[PDB]
Amino acid sequence: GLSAAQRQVVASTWKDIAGSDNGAGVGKECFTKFLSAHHDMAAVFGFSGASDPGVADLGAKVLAQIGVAVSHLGDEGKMVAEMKAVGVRHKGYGNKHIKAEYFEPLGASLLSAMEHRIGGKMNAAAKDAWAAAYADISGALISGLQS
Numbered sequence: 001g002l003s004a005a006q007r008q009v010v011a012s013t014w015k016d017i018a019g020s021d022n023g024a025g026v027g028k029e030c031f032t033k034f035l036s037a038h039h040d041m042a043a044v045f046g047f048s049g050a051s052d053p054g055v056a057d058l059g060a061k062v063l064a065q066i067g068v069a070v071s072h073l074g075d076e077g078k079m080v081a082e083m084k085a086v087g088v089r090h091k092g093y094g095n096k097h098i099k100a101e102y103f104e105p106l107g108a109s110l111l112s113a114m115e116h117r118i119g120g121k122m123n124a125a126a127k128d129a130w131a132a133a134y135a136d137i138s139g140a141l142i143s144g145l146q147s
């Protein structure tokens, strides 16, 4: 699971990529590749491919969640309180599908995008900490997900 160092290496890489945009250019470029490589979900998000500005609307709003979740990682006292609520919302979306199997990929593929901003600071302890933490952030959302 998350370690004492990874949990810290997470808040150290989120205070640079998000900064003020909170990951605005991290979700629009992350979900974009996901929607494309994943056409079965492109219709679930509400786009016609990886060329719709709507993606930046979801990723930008999704990245923020991970940001608020990066300040807790193991702290599931409140972090899961909001994330768990997201799942309860996804289960009541329009596609009526959503799967945690897609979360991992959308999470791992996200790290490949993070390097875009802190490409000079994204070190091994940074991509491995967010790769293991993304499982707890997106995983905690699977609590209220899947009605």
Ligand code: HEM
Pocket (backbone or CB within 6 Å): 041, 044, 045, 046, 058, 061, 062, 063, 065, 066, 086, 090, 093, 094, 095, 098, 099, 102, 103, 106, 137, 138, 141
């Ligand atoms: C890969 C599986 C996922 C699918 C298919 C999915 C799909 C969606 C869809 C369809 C929407 C709303 C579409 C619209 O804008 O009309 C949405 C919103 C959202 N998703 Fe996801 N999502 C997934 C994973 C995640 C994960 C892992 C997170 C957490 C990091 C997340 C966080 C959010 C947030 C925060 C919103 C917006 C809620 C708000 O209005 O505040 N989603 N998602």
